[PDB]
Amino acid sequence: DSFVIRGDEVRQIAPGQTGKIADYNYKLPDDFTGCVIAWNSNNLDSK
Amino acid sequence: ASVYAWNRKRISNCVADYSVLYNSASFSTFKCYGVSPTKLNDLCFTNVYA
């Protein structure tokens, strides 16, 4: 799964984590198996 | 108030929507103990001290 998010909101991307993106538009399973990889892309994706 | 002499407000006789706090981007942390912040609207108390 590939997307851009605000750097503060990366916390929401887990099993058991809580917040508006975890509630609405990117819920992971409560028993998710796998890896979350995130990095700053300001030089690529800001304007 | 200054942390040597911190100020305690009693909250009583009222309704609080804790989502108005917890949904805000303004807070650098919101760590909770004995309760989870998502549950606080479903639950109630004798008093709250801030």
Side-chain angles (χ1 to χ4, degrees):
Chain A
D1 301 328
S2 171
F3 55 90
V4 180
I5 205 179
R6 173 177 163 178
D8 296 303
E9 302 192 306
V10 175
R11 181 187 60 72
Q12 301 187 35
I13 314 177
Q17 278 282 355
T18 54
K20 61 186 67 176
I21 287 173
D23 191 12
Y24 305 143
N25 56 287
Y26 191 56
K27 183 75 180 90
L28 289 178
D30 301 343
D31 67 347
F32 171 70
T33 299
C35 299
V36 176
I37 307 90
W39 73 106
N40 187 336
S41 67
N42 190 47
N43 61 327
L44 313 185
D45 300 331
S46 295
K47 292 188 177 186
Chain B
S2 308
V3 69
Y4 92 95
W6 49 264
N7 183 23
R8 190 172 199 105
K9 191 182 182 70
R10 180 181 175 210
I11 297 101
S12 72
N13 314 87
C14 65
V15 165
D17 180 1
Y18 297 90
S19 309
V20 177
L21 309 180
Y22 183 59
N23 297 358
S24 186
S26 60
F27 303 124
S28 307
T29 187
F30 209 109
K31 180 62 180 181
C32 302
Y33 305 88
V35 292
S36 308
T38 51
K39 304 296 292 182
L40 297 175
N41 281 12
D42 203 28
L43 181 69
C44 81
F45 319 98
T46 63
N47 304 285
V48 174
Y49 306 99

